[PDB]
């Protein structure tokens with residue numbers, strides 16, 4: 001039968017729906033045939049190991065807007081066919097054991113936005129070869145470890161805006177060959193490594209606005225062969241010698257770019273680097 005507080009139906013997909021009830025625990029007895037489980041908007045604070053193990057055909061699991069504080073490392077064991085997992089809006093989660101998503105080889109969408117996440121642990125996204133959308137915005141991330149996304153060969157959207165990231169290291173984005181949109185705005189980025197985007201050959205959208213960049217190496221932009229939309233506004237660009245390479249790259253860029261306002265020298269304050277003549281910049 002259907003557990004209390006839940007409503008169950010069989011078509012078009014077997015669904016067990018128990019959202020917005022104020023539940024503290026995962027209902028016991030969720031139909032093993034469930035393809036979709038909706039538990040969002042409750043007051044669940046812990047997801048025990050094998051909480052959904054019997055539901056081998058589960059493809060959609062919503063646990064967003066709960067009060068998750070801890071997810072057992074084996075919470076999603078048995079869910080090899082899982083395609084969409086929404087854990088967003090659990091602001092006190094703070095950390096996810098790095099083995100939590102291992103084995104989710106069919107996962108296409110993973111929502112971890114607004115989870116107070118402080119770090120991306122070793123192997124957190126290992127083996128998620130089918131992942132296409134990864135939402136990590138509005139968390140508490142401050143660093144991007146090397147190769148964190150290297151197995152995400154099919155990822156097309158990576159949202160990291162609204163965190164406190166201060167640097168983009170050389171190997172942060174290795175392996176993201178299918179990436180189409182990379183959102184890094186509203187962070188504290190002060191430095192981008194010259195080879196930070198080496199593998200992003202299909203990237204079409206790059207947002208870096210609202211950060212702390214005073215300069216950006218053109219070598220980082222050089223391999224972005226498909227780039228079409230670039231936002232660099234709202235950074236304290238210094239328009240002296242150091243802006244000459246970026247100025248030349250902006251002249252060559254055939255896509256769409258935002259204004260690139262100079263913060264210094266006063267003479268050029270407020271002026272868009274794109275609209276200046278190289279004659280306007282101090283020489284090196």
Ligand SMILES: *[C@H]1O[C@H](CO)[C@@H](O[C@H]2O[C@H](CO)[C@@H](O[C@H]3O[C@H](CO[C@H]4O[C@H](CO)[C@@H](O)[C@H](O)[C@@H]4O)[C@@H](O)[C@H](O)[C@@H]3O)[C@H](O)[C@H]2NC(C)=O)[C@H](O)[C@H]1NC(C)=O
Nearest residue numbers: 013014030031032033034035053054055056057058059081
């Ligand atoms: C979730 O995963 C599957 C959903 O697609 C589902 O598959 C199986 O479902 C039945 C579980 O016992 C199993 O046996 C039933 O069907 C047998 C006859 O086969 C029928 O179904 C096939 C499906 O391809 C068709 O050729 C045709 O409809 C045929 O008549 C009989 O023994 C009984 O009718 C029995 O009830 C199915 O064979 C099997 N389906 C498939 C596609 O392989 C899983 O059961 C679900 N997992 C769980 C445990 O919830």
Ligand SMILES: *[C@@H]1O[C@H](CO)[C@@H](O[C@H]2O[C@H](CO)[C@@H](O[C@@H]3O[C@H](CO)[C@@H](O)[C@H](O)[C@@H]3O)[C@H](O)[C@H]2NC(C)=O)[C@H](O)[C@H]1NC(C)=O
Nearest residue numbers: 104105106107108127128129130131132152153154155178
């Ligand atoms: C990452 O995306 C890949 C590209 O979309 C995807 O590749 C494969 O996608 C399907 C699913 O396996 C394959 O389709 C097969 O096609 C062959 C005919 O050549 C037949 O065996 C049958 O028709 C089958 O559907 C694609 O061929 C294949 N794409 C290519 C060209 O490599 C990956 O599966 C995906 N990664 C993950 C883990 O989901």
